DNA sequence: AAGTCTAACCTATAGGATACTTACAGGGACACGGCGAAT
RNA sequence: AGCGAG
DNA sequence: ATTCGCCGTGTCCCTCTCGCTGGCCTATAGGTTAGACTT
């Protein structure tokens, strides 16, 4: 494999002959009866190749010996059968066709090369109107005298026709006139012949006029006719041509078309378009420039666009376009037969007839067939009708295989079946090790097949590989025990699609289990998102040395214990072990063998010598496991203060004794974190869990977090049985005060009813008084069954502890489920009142079904959004590779970082684990002139926060991805820390996936609640779409003149200098004013950016008047605030990766000297790289400006045509790589998956995939 | 058993003469084109 | 065309 | 009436993944091809 480029580009008739086999003559396919492609037809074996290998179609060639030889009587080259899926076909077009995607898609780059325009286009190649090829005019001066001349005598001939047809009448009339006078009759009788004679020399006059009128406009045309014009009115082509069908040409059809673009200069197009945007201005310049961008593609490269209009059309290999018999032997082809085969038709059909001579009307009729039939052919459905077969289903083309999911981009490129690979349903394994996973024998066996076969030849077992593979498929029993010893250290990767994160994807290793089902730990359920309801999850097989190397170390499930989004534990207790953990670890005043300090009765008989002895009591009911006793630990360091006082500094607690007043079932949780871990002696609500595991994966190993997980896990499982959290109708209490408040409540809201009844208010009035009075009832409610549960129920102890649910789930239980939704996202104001224990009535029910399927129809459209939000993001983000240890900029942001309070005080900044943590700093710490606090260059973590906030000091520089200063992509440091390793990330992470991933993981999880504030709202923000309510923001500081006025706003910002009044009128009165320290109080000194309005601020303006650093902050800030509305915690840097591949284009108004176009986007590295080029040899340094692109835009505006193309808009995309001639240079992560060779990410990189390792010296000596 | 030697079969071409004349979502975005002041 | 998991 | 600046309307590519089940009529010359004897 040697792969460097692939230079897309248009293919012209000679080399589509060039590739030819051969040429397909006729539309035969098979035959009738013995079943062989015929010759010269769609299969020929002559063409393409052999059907079968080593044969030939007369068949006097079978041996191998003589391979690479073509025979005689039939002429089949003797080669390979699988031949036939390269070697590749063509037809020769009688007349000249069109490429269907240049002429028909938008913008129509045939159109704009040629000056042409759509329909006009669609008139000239469908045979509709005539167009001029060239005239030559130059020797037209003294023509223009003879013609003068010849069309004077003509016009004499003309007049003197009517003057002869004016006499005639008027003989006619006088005529009738002797004729009506000579008899009686009626004077309007008799002047009825007047009338009819003076009506018939009317027309007659007319129709001279108007045809001298014709002749006139002819000639003038003539004085001014020009090429690149439609002739509509055939008549009026036959007059011309048949007058002067010398010296000019005139041609219809894509012939004409072809005649057009030859007789043409692309230099004196672009030259003229040079001109025109030196000198134009308007809607002409930007017509100009898109013109000069499709006329430059063709100039700057050596494409010619004689390339566009097709005399032969290619021919796919058979077995890209199937012929096979299937069921009863009936054979069952593709659709692409058939559009070829009409092509074909249309083909031999136009031959015959240009041959036999016919008149123009069905040759261009053929002609016109074969076009629409070849655009069929290349693209069904883009023009015409969509050729539909039998059923009226349209027949796919050949680009249909490329657009949407079914085309070959996004279905056998980005992702394939695979061997070695099963599925089945999972269930909890919970005597299993973190790091294990079990596996059914009978999946097991299959998937190891090819191994097992191995370890039993080699043992003996069978006598060859064939006999054990009978071995194998007969189950016989020595495998189970081979296959026991072929599976040890050897993992495999367990998936559950949806893949929506990293974590989706976890190595394990497999061990034998009995049954049919995939043992999972339950600890890493909460990674997978699984639940055991009939989930279902696929093995993999990693097969290479390599293969296996990265699923024991990069992906196995004990070395990720930390997800990548914001390091909050994932393989951590939950649900079930946290209920055992909170039961084991809480205390009970009042328990079983409390310790209490009698005296004179007996001393105090609450110590114990050993949490042996602590064990031994609460065996026999002398001790109960969460009551307070005073044990002697001798085997747990002590919390900080007992270890700093009682043994000073350094006091070892391995064999120490001290004494510890806790409770014995918080002695047994602690035995289970390691050694060091400082006693806890605390109530294990699950934060607390978080926050532990958390301490111990930052600070100890990853194998010891891993077994501590295990063991808690263990004893959680273990005791949350003994905690007899159980549900009964008896332990679900409703609250004693319902019925009086429901009353109460309800009186109010007869009152407010009886006040709409007098129309004291309007209906949507009432409305929202009532949806408010029971708003209070509801919060009364919940208020008061808080009150009244104690502690030890159930249904509370769930809720509290963590284990899973919210409180509002129970309040719904035992107590009233409040408001319910109007589907259309109002409040039905009854509300229900019954609790779902006492049991809901007919209608609350009915009212209730609303509700609850608006959200299952909300949650199944939001995935797919969330889905396609996540590929956009993971498409603009993964060239973001970290691949450089270090910048050494200077740049970087500031974090506010617990600013001082309004009274005096370091009260926190409630984001700082999202945006302060993980951080490496670009400065050094000093307050007031004092000594450096924390150095530059440094992994900032907790301890470093709370330096800082011990020392006085909020504003912090910070390195970040946004200030990054590398070439290709972001250096380590300015990156910072790797959540899931927790240390600086490698020189190979694709930190740029990782971002786009940990951000679109949280989607399914933002409800929508005009400006959108749900996930629309994340996905315009990254899109850069202008916001619904554009609030006008400040542009200069200075006083402000605000005005009610006739329903809007009227608002002047005093300019503090010479700036021009910006006043802003147009604003809906209903829109509030942004509110600050006052609703815009008259004359607030906003500055040249503050949002004057409160609603949304476009980030293209914000950027235009602030600058690129304002606008990120912005961006970041926004998309952090939708995001922590529902909770979630992602770092920005994720975010800030983002926004960098945002912002990484330059949008320049000065063409400066080297081939660039005003307004076009170019990326800012080679902005600076062509502006220091041309400062050098002329002076003409091209000055831009910062542009805010949306990210789908940034995907297709790339350096590589195969992402684009695999992207969206395939056909766009594609176009424009060949027009252009683009070069892919295969340096991408997606291009590399596509052609299959390693991704320049993790091992891929040249560093890591060219280490060499030999033993050292001293192992070879031992050798 | 291919190499003749014998005897069919099958199919691209072609040919026959009343009369008959017009089938059968939605959203965003951009590009192709209405309405108005200026020269 | 129907269905399971999210 | 053309220029330039606004609006206005029409036509088109995109909105998650992974499983499973079933359901006319000849006439003729030339190409082509069946079977059989053999040394
Ligand atoms: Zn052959
Ligand atoms: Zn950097």
């Given at each position: 494999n040697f792969f460097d480029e692939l230079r897309i580009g248009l293919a012209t008739a000679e080399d589509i002959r060039q590739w030819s086999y051969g040429e397909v003559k006729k539309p035969e396919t098979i035959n009738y009866r013995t079943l062989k492609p015929e010759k010269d037809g769609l299969f020929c074996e002559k063409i393409f190749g052999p059907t079968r290998d080593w044969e030939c179609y007369c068949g006097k060639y079978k041996r191998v010996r003589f391979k690479g030889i073509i025979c005689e009587r039939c002429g089949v080259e003797v080669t390979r059968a699988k031949v036939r899926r390269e070697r590749m076909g063509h037809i020769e077009l009688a007349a000249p066709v069109t490429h269907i995607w240049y002429f028909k898609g938008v913008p129509s780059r045939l159109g704009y090369l040629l000056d042409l325009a759509p329909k006009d286009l669609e008139k000239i190649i469908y045979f509709a109107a005539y167009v001029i090829t060239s005239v030559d005019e130059e020797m037209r001066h003294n023509e223009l005298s003879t013609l003068e001349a010849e069309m004077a005598v003509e016009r004499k001939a003309v007049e003197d026709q009517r003057d002869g047809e004016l006499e005639a009448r008027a003989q006619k009339l006088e005529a009738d006139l002797a004729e009506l006078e000579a008899e009686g009759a009626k004077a309007d009788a008799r002047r009825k012949v007047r009338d009819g004679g003076e009506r018939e020399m009317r027309q007659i006059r007319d129709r001279a006029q108007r045809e001298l009128d014709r002749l006139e406009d002819i000639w003038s045309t003539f004085t001014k006719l020009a090429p690149k014009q439609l002739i509509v009115d055939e008549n009026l082509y036959r007059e011309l041509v048949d007058r002067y069908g010398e010296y000019f040409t005139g041609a219809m059809g894509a012939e004409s078309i072809q005649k057009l673009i030859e007789n043409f200069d692309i230099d004196a197009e672009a030259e003229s378009l040079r001109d025109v945007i030196r000198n134009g201005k308007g809607q002409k310049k930007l017509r100009a420039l898109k013109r000069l961008k499709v006329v430059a593609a063709f100039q700057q490269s050596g494409n010619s666009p004689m390339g566009m209009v097709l005399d032969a059309v290619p021919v796919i290999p058979p077995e890209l376009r199937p012929m096979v018999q299937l069921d009863g032997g009936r054979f069952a082809t593709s659709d692409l037969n058939d559009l070829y085969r009409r092509v074909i038709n249309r083909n031999n059909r136009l031959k015959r007839l240009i041959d036999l001579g016919a008149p123009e009307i069905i040759v261009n009729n053929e002609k016109r067939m074969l076009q629409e039939s070849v655009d069929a052919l290349f693209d069904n459905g883009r023009r015409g009708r969509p050729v539909t077969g039998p059923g009226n289903r349209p027949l796919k083309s050949l680009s249909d295989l490329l657009k949407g999911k079914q085309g070959r981009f996004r279905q056998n490129l980005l992702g394939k079946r695979v061997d070695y690979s099963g599925r089945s349903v999972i269930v909890v394994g919970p005597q299993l090790k973190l790091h294990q996973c079990g596996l059914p024998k009978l999946m097991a066996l299959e998937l190891f097949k090819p191994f097992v076969m191995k370890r039993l030849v080699d043992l003996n077992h069978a006598q060859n590989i064939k006999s054990a593979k009978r071995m194998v498929e007969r189950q016989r029993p020595q495998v189970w025990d081979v296959l026991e010893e072929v599976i040890a250290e050897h993992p495999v990767l367990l998936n559950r699609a949806p893949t929506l994160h990293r974590l989706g994807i976890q190595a394990f290793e497999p061990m034998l289990v009995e049954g049919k089902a995939i043992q999972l730990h339950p600890l890493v359920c909460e990674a997978f998102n699984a639940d055991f309801d009939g989930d279902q999850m696929a093995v993999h097989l990693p097969l290479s040395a390599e293969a296996q190397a990265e699923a024991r170390i990069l992906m196995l499930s004990s070395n990720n214990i930390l997800s990548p989004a914001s390091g909050r534990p994932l393989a951590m207790p939950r649900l079930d072990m946290v209920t055992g953990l909170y039961y084991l670890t809480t205390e009970v005043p009042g328990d079983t063998g409390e310790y209490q300090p009698a005296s004179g009765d007996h001393p105090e008989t609450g110590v114990y010598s050993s949490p042996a002895e602590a064990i031994?009591?609460?065996?026999?009911?002398?001790?109960?496991?969460?009551?307070?006793?005073?044990?002697?630990?001798?085997?747990?360091?002590?919390?900080?203060?007992?270890?700093?006082?009682?043994?000073?500094?350094?006091?070892?607690?391995?064999?120490?004794?001290?004494?510890?007043?806790?409770?014995?079932?918080?002695?047994?949780?602690?035995?289970?974190?390691?050694?060091?871990?400082?006693?806890?002696?605390?109530?294990?609500?699950?934060?607390?869990?978080?926050?532990?595991?958390?301490?111990?994966?930052?600070?100890?190993?990853?194998?010891?977090?891993?077994?501590?997980?295990?063991?808690?896990?263990?004893?959680?499982?273990?005791?949350?049985?003994?905690?007899?959290?159980?549900?009964?109708?008896?332990?679900?209490?409703?609250?004693?005060?319902?019925?009086?408040?429901?009353?109460?409540?309800?009186?109010?809201?007869?009152?407010?009813?009886?006040?709409?009844?007098?129309?004291?208010?309007?209906?949507?009035?009432?409305?929202?008084?009532?949806?408010?009075?029971?708003?209070?009832?509801?919060?009364?409610?919940?208020?008061?069954?808080?009150?009244?549960?104690?502690?030890?129920?159930?249904?509370?102890?769930?809720?509290?502890?963590?284990?899973?649910?919210?409180?509002?789930?129970?309040?719904?239980?035992?107590?009233?489920?409040?408001?319910?939704?109007?589907?259309?996202?109002?409040?039905?104001?009854?509300?229900?009142?019954?609790?779902?224990?006492?049991?809901?009535?007919?209608?609350?029910?009915?009212?209730?079904?609303?509700?609850?399927?608006?959200?299952?129809?909300?949650?199944?459209?939001?995935?797919?959004?969330?889905?396609?939000?996540?590929?956009?993001?993971?498409?603009?983000?993964?060239?973001?590779?970290?691949?450089?240890?270090?910048?050494?900029?200077?740049?970087?942001?500031?974090?506010?970082?617990?600013?001082?309070?309004?009274?005096?005080?370091?009260?926190?900044?409630?984001?700082?684990?999202?945006?302060?943590?993980?951080?490496?700093?670009?400065?050094?710490?000093?307050?007031?002139?004092?000594?450096?606090?924390?150095?530059?260059?440094?992994?900032?973590?907790?301890?470093?926060?709370?330096?800082?906030?011990?020392?006085?000091?909020?504003?912090?520089?910070?390195?970040?991805?946004?200030?990054?200063?590398?070439?290709?992509?972001?250096?380590?440091?300015?990156?910072?820390?790797?959540?899931?390793?927790?240390?600086?990330?490698?020189?190979?992470?694709?930190?740029?996936?990782?971002?786009?991933?940990?951000?679109?993981?949280?989607?399914?999880?933002?409800?929508?609640?005009?400006?959108?504030?749900?996930?629309?709202?994340?996905?315009?923000?990254?899109?850069?779409?202008?916001?619904?309510?554009?609030?006008?923001?400040?542009?200069?500081?200075?006083?402000?003149?605000?005005?009610?006025?006739?329903?809007?706003?009227?608002?002047?910002?005093?300019?503090?200098?010479?700036?021009?009044?910006?006043?802003?009128?147009?604003?809906?009165?209903?829109?509030?004013?942004?509110?600050?320290?006052?609703?815009?109080?008259?004359?607030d000194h906003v500055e040249v950016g503050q949002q004057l309005m409160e609603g949304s601020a476009d980030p293209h303006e914000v950027l235009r008047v602030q600058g690129p650093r304002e606008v990120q902050i912005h961006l970041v800030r926004e998309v952090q605030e939708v995001y922590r509305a529902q909770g979630v915690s992602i770092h920005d840097k994720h975010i800030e990766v983002i926004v960098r591949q945002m912002l990484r284009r330059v949008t320049i108004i000065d063409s400066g000297s080297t081939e660039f176009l005003p307004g076009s986007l170019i990326d800012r590295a080679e902005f600076e790289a062509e502006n220091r080029r041309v400062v050098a040899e002329g002076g003409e340094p091209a000055a831009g400006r910062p542009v805010l692109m949306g990210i789908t835009k940034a995907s297709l505006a790339t350096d590589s045509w195969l992402s684009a193309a695999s992207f969206q808009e395939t056909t766009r995309v594609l176009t424009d790589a060949a027009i252009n001639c683009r070069s892919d240079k295969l340096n991408g992560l997606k291009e590399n998956v596509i052609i299959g060779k390693l991704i320049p990410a993790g091992t891929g990189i040249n560093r890591y995939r060219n280490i060499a390792v030999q033993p050292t010296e001293e192992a070879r000596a031992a050798a």
């Open positions: 031994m009591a609460a065996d026999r009911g002398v001790l109960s496991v969460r009551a307070k006793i005073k044990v002697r630990l001798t085997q747990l360091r002590p919390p900080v203060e007992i270890e700093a006082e009682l043994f000073g500094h350094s006091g070892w607690q391995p064999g120490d004794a001290w004494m510890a007043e806790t409770t014995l079932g918080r002695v047994m949780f602690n035995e289970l974190l390691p050694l060091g871990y400082p006693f806890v002696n605390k109530q294990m609500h699950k934060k607390v869990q978080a926050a532990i595991i958390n301490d111990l994966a930052e600070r100890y190993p990853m194998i010891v977090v891993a077994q501590t997980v295990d063991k808690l896990k263990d004893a959680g499982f273990y005791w949350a049985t003994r905690s007899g959290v159980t549900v009964s109708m008896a332990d679900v209490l409703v609250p004693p005060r319902k019925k009086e408040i429901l009353d109460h409540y309800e009186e109010r809201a007869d009152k407010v009813e009886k006040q709409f009844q007098r129309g004291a208010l309007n209906h949507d009035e009432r409305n929202e008084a009532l949806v408010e009075i029971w708003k209070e009832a509801t919060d009364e409610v919940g208020q008061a069954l808080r009150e009244h549960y104690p502690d030890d129920n159930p249904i509370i102890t769930i809720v509290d502890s963590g284990a899973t649910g919210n409180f509002t789930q129970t309040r719904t239980l035992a107590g009233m489920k409040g408001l319910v939704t109007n589907p259309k996202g109002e409040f039905i104001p009854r509300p229900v009142k019954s609790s779902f224990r006492e049991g809901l009535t007919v209608l609350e029910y009915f009212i209730n079904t609303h509700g609850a399927r608006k959200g299952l129809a909300d949650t199944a459209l939001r995935t797919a959004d969330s889905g396609y939000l996540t590929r956009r993001l993971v498409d603009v983000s993964q060239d973001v590779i970290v691949r450089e240890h270090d910048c050494q900029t200077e740049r970087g942001i500031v974090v506010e970082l617990a600013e001082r309070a309004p009274d005096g005080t370091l009260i926190r900044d409630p984001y700082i684990e999202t945006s302060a943590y993980a951080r490496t700093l670009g400065t050094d710490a000093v307050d007031e002139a004092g000594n450096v606090i924390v150095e530059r260059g440094q992994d900032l973590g907790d301890p470093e926060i709370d330096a800082l906030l011990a020392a006085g000091i909020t504003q912090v520089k910070v390195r970040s991805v946004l200030t990054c200063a590398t070439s290709t992509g972001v250096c380590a440091t300015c990156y910072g820390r790797s959540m899931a390793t927790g240390k600086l990330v490698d020189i190979g992470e694709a930190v740029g996936i990782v971002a786009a991933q940990s951000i679109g993981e949280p989607g399914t999880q933002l409800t929508m609640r005009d400006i959108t504030g749900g996930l629309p709202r994340v996905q315009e923000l990254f899109e850069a779409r202008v916001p619904r309510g554009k609030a006008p923001i400040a542009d200069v500081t200075g006083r402000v003149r605000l005005e009610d006025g006739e329903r809007f706003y009227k608002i002047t910002i005093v300019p503090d200098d010479g700036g021009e009044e910006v006043v802003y009128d147009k604003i809906s009165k209903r829109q509030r004013l942004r509110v600050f320290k006052r609703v815009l109080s008259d004359g």
